C-alpha cells in the first residue's frame, strides 16, 4: 500500500511496515534561481548562491567566486584566501552542527540541539561582526572579500575554538556510545562505494563507504595545500560511521581554523585591479578613475571572457559545483547549480529499501537534505 507524507513530500510503498520503495517529490521549493541568475549580473547573482544550501552559506559564495575567477583569471591576495578558508571552515562547522542536531532530534534526542545552537549563535555573531547579517552574508566576492576583518575577531575565534573543542567532546560523550543511538544508526541505510559512485554521492556520504577521496586534497582550491589537516573515512558506510565522520570533520575544521588564525598574513582583502574589484570609498571619492570604475562596476559588471567551466568545492554537504557559461557580456548566459543534495535524495530510494519509517527519517537526517539547494 502507498502511504503519503506532506517542504518534504514523500510516498512510500509498504508491505509489513517494511519500506519497499520511497519516492520523494521535491519541486515544492523551486524558485527559478537559474533563470534569475541568467537575468541578473554576477554581483547581483551572488546572493542567489547565498540562498542556495542556506545552512552552509559561504561555501556557495566560495564556489561561485572561484568559478568567476576561473573564467576571469584574477589573482586573489593571500590574506583574502586565508580569511575565505577560515570562514569556509566556520561554515562547515555550522552546517555539521545543524545536521547532527537535527538528525538527533529526528531520532529523538532533543537536548544537544540547543547546545549546538548556542555554538551556532556564537558563529553567527562572528558572521554578523565580520559582515552584514548573521545569515546570507554576501561577504565572499570574486577577486577577494567585501571587507576586512574587524579587530578582535581573531581573539574571539580562538576563544570559541577552545570552548568548541570542549563542546565537541561534550556532544560526542552524550551521543556516541549510547545504546539507543547505536541501535538507531548502525546498519541503517548502508551504501557500498560502487553504489555511491553510481549514484553520484559526494562528501561525507561518499567517504562513508570509504572511497578515501576528498575535494580539498584532490583539487586544493585554497591554502588547503598548506594546512595539513585530516580527512576521515568510514570502514563500512552507514549512519553511525557518517555521524562519526561528521564529528571528525568538525574537529579538523577547528584545526584548520586555528592554523588560518595562526598564519594569516597582512595585506589586502581583494583583487588589486579596479576593473574587476570595486575601489574603496576614499579612493572613489578622491580619484577620478576610481570614481569611473566604481560607477561602471556598480551599474554594469565585469565582462568575463566568453567561456564555459565547471568549478566544484567541498561544501559541508558534499561537492557543490557551479557550471558557468558566458558570452562575453556582463550577465551569465547559463548557470547550472549541482548541489550535493540532489544526488543524495536520489540515493534515498535504494538507501531506505527494506527499512522502516524511522529508518527512512534517520536516512534523511544523515543525508542532510536542504531543499533549497535541491530545488535550485
Amino acid at each position: 500500500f502507498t502511504l503519503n507524507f506532506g517542504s518534504l513530500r514523500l510516498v512510500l510503498e509498504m508491505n509489513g511496515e517494511v519500506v519497499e520503495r520511497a519516492e520523494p517529490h521535491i519541486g515544492l521549493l523551486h524558485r527559478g534561481t537559474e533563470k534569475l541568475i541568467e537575468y541578473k549580473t554576477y554581483l547581483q547573482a551572488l546572493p542567489y548562491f547565498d540562498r542556495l544550501d542556506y545552512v552552509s552559506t559561504m561555501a556557495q559564495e566560495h564556489a561561485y567566486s572561484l568559478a568567476v575567477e576561473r573564467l576571469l583569471n584574477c589573482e586573489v591576495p593571500l590574506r583574502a584566501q586565508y580569511i575565505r578558508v577560515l570562514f569556509c571552515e566556520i561554515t562547515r562547522i555550522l552546517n555539521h552542527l545543524l545536521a547532527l542536531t537535527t538528525h538527533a532530534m529526528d531520532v529523538g534526542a532533543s537536548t544537544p540541539f540547543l547546545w549546538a545552537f548556542e555554538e551556532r549563535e556564537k558563529l553567527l555573531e562572528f558572521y554578523e561582526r565580520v559582515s552584514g547579517a548573521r545569515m546570507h552574508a554576501s561577504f565572499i566576492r570574486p577577486g577577494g572579500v567585501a571587507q576586512d576583518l574587524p579587530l578582535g575577531l581573531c581573539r574571539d575565534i580562538d576563544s570559541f575554538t577552545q570552548q568548541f573543542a570542549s563542546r565537541i567532546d561534550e556532544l560526542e560523550e552524550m551521543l556516541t556510545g549510547n545504546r539507543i543511538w547505536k541501535q538507531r544508526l548502525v546498519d541503517i541505510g548502508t551504501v557500498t562505494a560502487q553504489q555511491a559512485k553510481d549514484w553520484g554521492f559526494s562528501g561525507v556520504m561518499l567517504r562513508g563507504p570509504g572511497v578515501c577521496w576528498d575535494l580539498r586534497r584532490a583539487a586544493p582550491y585554497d591554502v588547503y595545500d598548506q594546512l595539513d589537516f585530516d580527512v576521515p573515512v568510514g570502514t563500512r558506510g552507514d549512519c553511525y560511521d557518517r555521524y562519526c565522520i561528521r564529528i571528525e570533520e568538525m574537529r579538523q575544521s577547528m584545526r584548520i581554523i586555528w592554523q588560518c588564525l595562526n598564519k594569516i598574513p597582512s595585506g589586502m582583502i581583494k583583487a588589486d585591479d579596479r576593473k574587476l574589484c570595486p575601489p574603496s570609498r576614499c579612493r572613489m571619492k578622491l580619484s577620478m578613475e576610481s570614481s569611473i570604475h566604481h560607477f561602471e562596476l556598480y551599474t554594469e559588471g565585469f565582462s568575463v571572457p566568453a567561456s564555459s567551466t565547471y568549478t566544484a568545492v567541498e561544501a559541508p554537504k558534499g561537492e557543490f559545483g557551479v557550471f558557468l557559461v558566458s558570452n562575453g557580456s556582463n550577465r551569465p548566459y547559463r548557470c547550472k547549480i549541482r548541489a550535493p543534495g540532489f544526488a543524495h535524495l536520489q540515493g534515498l530510494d535504494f538507501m531506505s529499501k527494506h527499512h522502516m519509517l524511522a529508518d527512512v527519517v534517520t536516512i534523511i537526517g544523515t543525508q542532510d537534505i536542504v531543499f533549497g539547494e535541491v530545488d535550485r
Binding site: 519541486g27 515544492l28 523551486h30 534569475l36 545552537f117 549563535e121 547579517a133 546570507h136
Partner: protein
C-alpha cells in the same frame, strides 16, 4: 451599555486576552531559509517557551501559523489546506521577504508574491532573514495585537 456592566465586560475581555496572549501555540511553516533562523529563535538564547510559545506539529491544535520561507505555486495549495484546518481563533505571521511580497524571487515563475495572496496574514516580519530578535519582536507584536480583542464586548453589543 452601563458603566458597571462595561467594567465587568472589560475585565472579562482582559482575562480572555491575557489567556490567549500567554498561551500562543504557533505552528511552523518552515520552507526555504527563514526556518533556520526560526529554529535559532526557538533555541536557548532567544527562547520562545518563556512567553508561552511552543510549536505544535498538528495544525488542529495550533493557534497561529508562522509562514517562514518562500511560497511556491506547488506548495501554496498545501499551505492553504493546512491553514483551513486551524481553529477559528487564528493568526498568521509572515516571516522574511519571500513570504511578504516574494522577496528575492519576486520576478520568478512558480513563486507566490507573498503569502498574503493565499492566506490572510496578520503581521509581517521584515528581514532576509529577520534576526531572531526581530522574529521574537514580531511574536510580541502579535501578543500586543491580540491584547486589544474585545470579543466579549462585541458579542454583548450586537
Amino acid at each position: 451599555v452601563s458603566k458597571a456592566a462595561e467594567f465587568v465586560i472589560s475585565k472579562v475581555d482582559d482575562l480572555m486576552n491575557w489567556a490567549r496572549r500567554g498561551s500562543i501555540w504557533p505552528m511552523t511553516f518552515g520552507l526555504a531559509c527563514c526556518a533556520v533562523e526560526m529554529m535559532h529563535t526557538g533555541a536557548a538564547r532567544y527562547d520562545l517557551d518563556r512567553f508561552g510559545i511552543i510549536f505544535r506539529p498538528s495544525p488542529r491544535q495550533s493557534d497561529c501559523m508562522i509562514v517562514a520561507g518562500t511560497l511556491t505555486n506547488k506548495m501554496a495549495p498545501a499551505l492553504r489546506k493546512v491553514y483551513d484546518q486551524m481553529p477559528e481563533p487564528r493568526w498568521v505571521i509572515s516571516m522574511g521577504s519571500c513570504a511578504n511580497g516574494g522577496g528575492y524571487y519576486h520576478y520568478s515563475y512558480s513563486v507566490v508574491r507573498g503569502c498574503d495572496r493565499i492566506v490572510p496574514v496578520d503581521i509581517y516580519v521584515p528581514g532576509c532573514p529577520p534576526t531572531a530578535e526581530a522574529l521574537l519582536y514580531g511574536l510580541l507584536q502579535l501578543q500586543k495585537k491580540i491584547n486589544r480583542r474585545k470579543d466579549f464586548l462585541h458579542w454583548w453589543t450586537k
